[PDB]
Amino acid sequence: MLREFSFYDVPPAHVPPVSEPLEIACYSLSRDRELLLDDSKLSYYYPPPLFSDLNTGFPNRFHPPKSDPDPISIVKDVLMTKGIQMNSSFLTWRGLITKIMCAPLDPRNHWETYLVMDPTSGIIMMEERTNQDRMCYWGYKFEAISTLPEIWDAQDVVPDEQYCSIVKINIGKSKLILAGEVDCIWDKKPENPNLHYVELKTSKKYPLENYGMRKKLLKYWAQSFLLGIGRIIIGFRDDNGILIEMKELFTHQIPKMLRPYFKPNDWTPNRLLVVLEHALEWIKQTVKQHPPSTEFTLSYTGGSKLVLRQII
Ligand SMILES: Cc1cc2nc3c(=O)[nH]c(=O)nc-3n(C[C@H](O)[C@H](O)[C@H](O)COP(=O)(O)OP(=O)(O)OC[C@H]3O[C@@H](n4cnc5c(N)ncnc54)[C@H](O)[C@@H]3OP(=O)(O)O)c2cc1C
Ligand SMILES: [Mg+2]
Ligand SMILES: [Mg+2]
């Protein structure tokens, strides 16, 4: 027995309201994976030298990332440890909402998540249960050379070391608690901090007329939008992996920058939000229609549809 949700069955609607994502907790992960309830792993952004060689250190200074999905119970336990109550509809990693939201854009990227409603809180928890080639290293390396740790109050490329923000964000009728990795911060951490946060990306530069470039930027936007990240800073590199150009974007500016280039068919920020809000309402309706602790999988395998299965 399958339940299916059609991207294209969603009528043209007004873009749903989305609240300013509010940080309710944060934590750091040491290089050794120790989970610390502090900001010791929040780094500051500082522009690296132009023509930096992103190959430097690959592979002998590269500690490849863990490469196993993290259970979302980590985040539930963080909130429990700090005595924060979960009064929302969804609890998951930011990147798993990005996957739902951007699925219309990415027929090639197939994924599967696991959902269970928590019996005490009633929130729907979602996780994966199921990245270190030279291309990804350039990404990790750009993050490394573009950041500065806290020093006053306190090289190898260790993507396992991370800072994480946990936000409350409302998308239409769905209240979500989302945990996501924050690459660094623009200035002193305050007022809600997320607009101060920065996402770092590395990419070849293509014109905005290029459909692939637009799709990539839309995914950049979606990711940072879901965590309230104020800035996305792109290190443009050439085919040799040399840093050529720094581009500082404000997240809210990406939908504006792309407006003159969308073709009449294209997926737009507003269309993506409309569909996402319908998908979330559908997931919620389907799950709540059962007793808590019932396990489901949410799958996308190409085409136009999400499929929710009850696990037995
Ligand atoms: C089989 C499998 C292996 C995974 N291995 C890792 C891992 O080694 N480290 C990790 O942080 N998360 C890994 N994940 C994903 C985590 O379970 C979790 O969803 C995620 O870490 C939550 O953090 P978000 O900030 O919401 O992740 P996202 O919004 O999805 O991505 C943010 C950043 O997390 C990093 N990241 C995300 N996914 C992976 C991945 N699959 N492998 C390596 N780095 C990744 C990467 O630097 C990425 O930056 P960028 O987008 O610029 O490339 C894995 C998932 C699966 C299914
Ligand atoms: Mg990182
Ligand atoms: Mg990044």
Residue numbers in the entry: 1 to 130, 138 to 161, 173 to 208, 231 to 352
Quote the study's own text.
The DXO/Rai1 family of proteins consists of mammalian DXO and fungal Rai1 and Dxo1. DXO enzymes are capable of removing the entire cap structure by hydrolyzing the phosphodiester linkage between the first and second encoded nucleotides, releasing GpppN from unmethylated capped RNA (GpppN-RNA), and they can release the intact NAD+ from NAD+-capped RNA. A single active site is used for all the DXO/Rai1 hydrolytic activities, which are mediated by binding of the scissile phosphate to two divalent cations (magnesium or manganese) that are coordinated by conserved acidic residues. The eukaryotic DXO/Rai1 decapping enzymes can eliminate diverse 5′ modifications from RNA, and here we show two additional activities for them: release of FAD and dpCoA caps from RNA (deFADding and deCoAping).
We were also able to observe good-quality electron density for FADP in complex with wild-type SpRai1, in a structure at 1.9 Å resolution. The overall structure of the wild-type SpRai1 is essentially the same as that of the triple mutant, with rms distance of 0.2 Å for their equivalent Cα atoms, and the binding mode of FADP is essentially the same as well, confirming that the mutations do not perturb the binding mode of FADP. Two magnesium ions were observed in the structure of the wild-type complex, one occupying metal binding site 1 and close to the 3′ phosphate of FADP. The other magnesium ion is coordinated by Glu199 and five waters, occupying a position that is similar to that seen for the third metal ion in the structure of Candida albicans Rai1 in complex with pU5 and manganese. The catalytic role of this metal ion (if any) is not known. The bound conformation and position of FADP in SpRai1 are highly similar to those in mDXO, indicating that the two enzymes have a conserved mechanism of recognizing this cap and catalyzing the deFADding reaction. However, loop 65–71 of SpRai1, which contains residues that are not conserved in DXO, makes more intimate contacts to flavin.
